Amino acid sequence: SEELLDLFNRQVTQEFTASQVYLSASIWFDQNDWEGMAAYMLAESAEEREHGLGFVDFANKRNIPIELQAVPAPVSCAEWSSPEDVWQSILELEQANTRSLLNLAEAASTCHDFAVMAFLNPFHLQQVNEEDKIGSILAKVTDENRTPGLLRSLDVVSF
Amino acid sequence: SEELLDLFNRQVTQEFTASQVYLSASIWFDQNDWEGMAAYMLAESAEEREHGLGFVDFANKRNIPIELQAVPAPVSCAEWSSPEDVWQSILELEQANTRSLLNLAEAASTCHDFAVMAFLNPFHLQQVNEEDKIGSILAKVTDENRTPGLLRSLDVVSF
Amino acid sequence: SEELLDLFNRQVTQEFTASQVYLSASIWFDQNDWEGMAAYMLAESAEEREHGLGFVDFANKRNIPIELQAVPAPVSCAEWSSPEDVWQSILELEQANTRSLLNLAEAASTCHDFAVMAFLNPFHLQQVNEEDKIGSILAKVTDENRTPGLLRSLDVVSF
Amino acid sequence: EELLDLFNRQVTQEFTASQVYLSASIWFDQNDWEGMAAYMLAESAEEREHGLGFVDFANKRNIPIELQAVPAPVSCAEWSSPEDVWQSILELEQANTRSLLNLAEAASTCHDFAVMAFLNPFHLQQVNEEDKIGSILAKVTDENRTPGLLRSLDVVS
Amino acid sequence: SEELLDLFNRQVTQEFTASQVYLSASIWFDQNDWEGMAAYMLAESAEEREHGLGFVDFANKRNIPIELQAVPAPVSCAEWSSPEDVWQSILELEQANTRSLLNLAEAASTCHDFAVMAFLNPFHLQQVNEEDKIGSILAKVTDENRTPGLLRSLDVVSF
Ligand SMILES: [Fe+3]
Ligand SMILES: [Fe+3]
Ligand SMILES: [Fe+3]
Ligand SMILES: [Fe+3]
Ligand SMILES: [Fe+3]
Ligand SMILES: [Fe+3]
Ligand SMILES: [Fe+3]
Ligand SMILES: [Fe+3]
Ligand SMILES: [Fe+3]
Ligand SMILES: [Fe+3]
Ligand SMILES: [Fe+3]
Ligand SMILES: [Fe+3]
Ligand SMILES: [Fe+3]
Ligand SMILES: [Fe+3]
Ligand SMILES: [Fe+3]
Ligand SMILES: [Fe+3]
Ligand SMILES: [Fe+3]
Ligand SMILES: [Fe+3]
Ligand SMILES: [Fe+3]
């Protein structure tokens, strides 16, 4: 019971942690003049914030008390020295959002909490699409960057 | 007091000097068949002329006498043998426009000339955006030109 | 700063003093059948009251207490005998308004009151425009009035 | 090529004229002739467009252009009334016309039919311009015979 | 006199010869799967036909008898083994159209035939723009083809 409350609460922190990692990725791309990839990251930073606010709003409706935790400093921007490194961290970040949601669904399932299971369904399916989209961008970036300059030519055109 | 008059007057010459450097860059790019970069430079040549005319118009309103100086021949087109060289001179040129405006703001500040400080504010912020935009283009051009031909393929698509 | 609060209060008084002086000019012009110059003066009497109202609204928001002072009786109308005299008094009035504003900005700058200085900026620039416009009308009035009846032909035309 | 040199000098002459027009705009604004000031500011932008048109044709025709300094205007020092300013501007347009005719004579000697064709609309624009300027100068010279009267007509044009 | 008739007549053959060379270039590009460059050539083939018909129409109006000559087989498509070779032949072809028009203008000039000189003026200026545009495309193609594959990537995007 309490475990469900705790995992709901942790989900909000995970989505806001992901919002800040995406903002860090936007900064790294703008600082290195990848304005197209920076705008994509900034849009995802706002979207993850929206995911967190949806969990807050449902929790309030369901009388699940939310206590906002610290949103950790992103520190993957330590590692990053090329756009591949940034997109690989973003892929790992979406995988962690997916695992957080599955853990939460498992707790709900154990509790027979059908309303929380229902609420999570569109997020499970969102995550499938997000991991697919980021996986695909990572593949494109890794392939284009085999030729000097070429990756730039595709921040400019796409994004 | 007089120093403020002189620096106002010099600002007009700096913006018209920059207008002519951008026209020289347009010529170098058209002569070398970079029609996209040439059209960007020609647009900036007109914009710097507009900055100079705004300083003339304010000076007339504020009874700061303007005496138009010679606009020097651009001679950076000596150096240029690749688009990187052109964009690097343009970056240096915007940095000199920014320094000219800051010197002018310092004189105004010393004189407690609040109207001239206010007038300069949108130009300080314009310059921040211009140095950022030219820095970013220079980075893109330097990276694309690591592969023969590739830079061309992006005059054509962007610009 | 007592100085800064008093000068803010004084600025409201100066804008309302100027409103009344413009209304006095409108009466002189209407009495002497210069209906075009009267309507100009009436529009400016309303604009200077809007300036004073702008200062009262910002003072209220910034917790600057406003004590409304008397708006003195205009005295120049006792001595005006031609349009040139009236326009010369309005130029002087505008020069006063600008001095009052620069005094207030000097007090704000000493107090490092960044918000008050930022509020004043559009008024600094408006005064450059108003002094230029009045000085140019005064110049046209003074030249046209060298031929009998010619200035009348220009209240009728412009205004 | 004296042809090449004259084509470069034409760019410099148009930008020289742009600056002389801007200097006339400033003398008029300083002296509260805002109407005549706006006419000269428009001409200053038009002359810069004539120079840009020359640069563009030279780039297409592979005529190398090397931008020269644009000399500071000096006729403002002597102006004391609008008639002086307008008289300098008529002299400036006569100089622009002469520069175009010198370029056209070299193109004709060279049998450069493309450059002669390119110049034709500029020869006709100069006729129109010298006419308009000579007409305004005549109107200003006549109106300024009565004190104040010229002013009364800046404000109405 | 007769020389003017002959050179008018030869101009029609030159424009129709150029129409067929452009059609040959379209075929070579379609056969080698350069559909963007093929469509440009086909458009120029129709345009040169239009230039020839304009000369026919003026000649009819001016009572210059036209006798249509054989339009020669294009045989530059012998040489061609890369798009650079095609564009270089097209540049040479526009240079020959320009020379044909200048020869014709010289004959008209000698004859003091002011109507034929006037008629040719827009064609002299068309040619300046055409040689500039083809020169520029040739430069782009020669530079892009320094990297395998890259030129293709710009038939697809431009054209
Ligand atoms: Fe997302
Ligand atoms: Fe997304
Ligand atoms: Fe999320
Ligand atoms: Fe996500
Ligand atoms: Fe700019
Ligand atoms: Fe720009
Ligand atoms: Fe500038
Ligand atoms: Fe700039
Ligand atoms: Fe006002
Ligand atoms: Fe006003
Ligand atoms: Fe006021
Ligand atoms: Fe006022
Ligand atoms: Fe003109
Ligand atoms: Fe001109
Ligand atoms: Fe002109
Ligand atoms: Fe064509
Ligand atoms: Fe074409
Ligand atoms: Fe043709
Ligand atoms: Fe052609």
Residue numbers in the entry:
A (entry chain F), B (entry chain F), C (entry chain A), E (entry chain F): 1 to 159
D (entry chain B): 2 to 158
The authors write:
A novel ferritin was recently found in Pseudo-nitzschia multiseries (PmFTN), a marine pennate diatom that plays a major role in global primary production and carbon sequestration into the deep ocean. Ferritin is a 24-mer that forms a hollow sphere, takes up soluble ferrous iron, oxidizes it at di-iron ferroxidase centers, and stores the iron oxide mineral in its central cavity. Sites A and B comprise the conserved ferroxidase active site, and site C forms a pathway leading toward the central cavity where iron storage occurs. The structures confirm the typical ferritin arrangement: 24 subunits assemble to form a hollow spherical shell.
